[PDB]
Design a protein around this ligand. Structure first.
Ligand SMILES: COc1cnc(COc2ccc(F)c(F)c2)cc1-c1cc2c([nH]1)CCNC2=O
Length: 302
């Protein structure tokens, strides 16, 4: 017939964008509004579905600061598709663009926003569980949120507050490891159920990754994922916070605070934000959204 893929009544499906995926993320256009969007695709033949309830997570998160807007969820040929707001490049893309190292001012502007971002997710009874530079995207040049750090991909998310009982999920171990090893909390490595603290510790590992240029357990390889996970975990436990965060006292304080959080414990997000805003003010920085990548040549979907 037409040979063109449509999602819903108005979404024309475009070229696939980004790296990785393998066809799962495509540029799209809302023909009714003449606006571009991002379209996430999942083969209806999938072994491990995630799309539909991620969509539900996007709904639960509702409209929120730094949360991409979701417009549609529906069948598209042999895929299920989720149409959402198109954003800009990820922190990982930007990191490469900035020669794999961010200034403290940039990391703090990022950290302050992400603690709030994670607190928001947590306020909706969800724990993220997929912290990494690739899942944090800036907005688009012009759609006035380009300086806002957004959080995407809630495929590994989980409700940590049982909706009926209204109780925190029970503690338990023997959870299989799947997340990204480089940033995961030490407890995640131990096979323990993840909770709020774990999202915050992963953020800490990522902040240090940005500040140092790399993490000390980063190049560990093994004959089995399980073994790699075990080596990385061993090195994380074997690297003293004071050493990992040398030259960044606030980061060391942030990190050991979260590392010491109890499984059920609500993090003191205000306390964590203040560690960074006080530092920010002390260094004489001004929160003006002028990241290290500002002025560089940024990548694009279109
Ligand atoms: C909110 O959904 C998105 C919205 N906008 C963009 C930006 O697309 C770009 C592509 C190339 C550019 F060079 C670029 F600058 C931007 C990306 C996403 C996105 C969502 C997901 C992923 N990516 C990969 C993993 N799982 C996801 O759920």
């Amino acid at each position: 017939g037409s040979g063109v893929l449509m999602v819903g009544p108005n979404f024309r499906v475009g070229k696939k964008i980004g790296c990785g995926n393998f066809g799962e993320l495509r540029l799209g256009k809302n023909l009714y509004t003449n606006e571009y969007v991002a379209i996430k695709l999942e083969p209806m033949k999938s072994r491990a579905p995630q799309l539909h309830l991620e969509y539900r997570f996007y709904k639960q998160l509702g409209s929120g600061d730094g949360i991409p807007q979701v417009y549609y969820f529906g069948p598209c040929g042999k895929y299920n598709a989720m149409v959402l707001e198109l954003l800009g490049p990820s922190l990982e893309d930007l990191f490469d663009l900035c020669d794999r190292t961010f200034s403290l001012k940039t990391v703090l502007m990022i950290a302050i926003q992400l603690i709030s971002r994670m607190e928001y997710v947590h306020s909706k009874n969800l724990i993220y569980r997929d912290v990494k530079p690739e899942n944090f995207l800036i907005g688009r040049p012009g759609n006035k949120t380009q300086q806002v750090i957004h959080i995407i991909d809630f495929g590994l998310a989980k409700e940590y507050i049982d909706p009926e009982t209204k109780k925190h999920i029970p503690y338990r171990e023997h959870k299989s490891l799947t997340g990204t090893a480089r940033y995961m909390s030490i407890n995640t490595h131990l096979g323990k159920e993840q909770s709020r603290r774990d999202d915050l510790e992963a953020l800490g590992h990522m902040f240090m990754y940005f500040l140092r240029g790399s993490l000390p357990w980063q190049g560990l390889k093994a004959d089995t994922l399980k073994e790699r996970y075990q080596k990385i975990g061993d090195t994380k436990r074997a690297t003293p916070i004071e050493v990992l965060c040398e030259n960044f006292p606030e980061m060391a304080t942030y990190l050991r605070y979260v590392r010491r959080l109890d499984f059920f414990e609500k993090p003191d997000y205000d306390y964590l934000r203040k560690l960074f805003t006080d530092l920010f003010d002390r260094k004489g920085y001004m929160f003006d959204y002028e990241y290290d990548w500002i002025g560089k040549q940024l990548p694009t979907p279109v």
